[PDB]
Design a binder for this molecule. Structure first.
Ligand code: ZN
Ligand code: ZN
Lengths: 235, 4, 7
């Protein structure tokens, strides 16, 4: 997360860290006691041996796994979205099952899933969170980073991202002048919008031209467009 | 790549 | 669901 600030313990109880061979590489969001929604390019080409993935919940400081509110789970199964296209960076989303259930605490909670036709209009301010790079090609964070970003219209995003095909399964966010954006190491992490006291999973950090650059919004997988596929796994 |  | 629980 670039241009963000250090979040405190419990701020985002649904945000989870993912480790591949004990190496933190992506974020994901808890949506039940058993499943996590993350990005497909996180597990692409390394999804056949699921126990090689670790999900760390209730985490705060990446340099501190000793906190008593943390819980670790091995990944039982990884279900990449059937239409993921690495070349097109389209449908960058994936389900991950925790071998063992987690126990909901004040530091571990599921994020609400948006309605299928939940509208996220431009100007709408939302939040991104992750332990990724603090600047492009820079070092990742320790304290979980958080940031607020305004959503764009796909029309406007396609505009600033001519080198890509902004599909209806994507949603973008970011400032015209740049400064705040999701970066490497944040993929799989959420893009959340509070809808009346409740936080909804709007997007899934997917891709974008570098990070925090002006008129170069971060692209996310538009969750409302996958809300049914996701809820089918629920249990 | 550009992927995050 | 979607609620922060820390003061
Ligand atoms: Zn439908
Ligand atoms: Zn289950």
């Amino acid at each position: 997360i670039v241009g963000g600030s250090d979040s405190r313990e419990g701020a985002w109880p649904w945000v989870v860290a993912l480790y591949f061979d004990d190496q933190q590489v992506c974020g994901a969001s808890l949506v039940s006691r058993d499943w996590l929604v993350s990005a497909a390019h996180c597990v692409y080409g390394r999804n056949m041996e699921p126990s090689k993935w670790k999900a760390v919940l209730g985490l705060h400081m990446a340099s501190n796994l000793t906190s008593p509110q943390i819980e670790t789970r091995l990944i039982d199964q990884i279900v990449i979205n059937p239409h993921y296209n690495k070349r097109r960076k389209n449908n960058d989303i994936a389900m991950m099952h925790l071998e063992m259930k987690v126990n909901y605490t004040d530091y571990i909670q599921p994020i609400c899933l948006p309605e299928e036709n939940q509208v996220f209009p431009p100007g709408r301010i939302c939040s991104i969170a992750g332990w990724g790079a603090l600047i492009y090609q820079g070092s990742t964070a320790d304290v979980l980073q958080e940031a607020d970003v305004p959503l764009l219209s796909n029309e406007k995003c396609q505009q600033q991202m001519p080198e890509y095909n902004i599909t209806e399964n994507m949603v973008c966010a970011g400032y015209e002048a740049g400064g705040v954006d999701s970066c490497q190491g944040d993929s799989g992490g959420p893009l959340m919008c509070q809808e009346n006291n409740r936080w909804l999973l709007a997007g899934v950090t997917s891709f974008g031209y570098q990070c925090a650059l002006p008129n170069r919004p971060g692209v996310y997988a538009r969750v409302p467009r996958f809300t049914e596929w996701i809820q089918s796994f629920l249990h | 790549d550009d992927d995050k | 669901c979607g609620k922060k629980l820390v003061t």
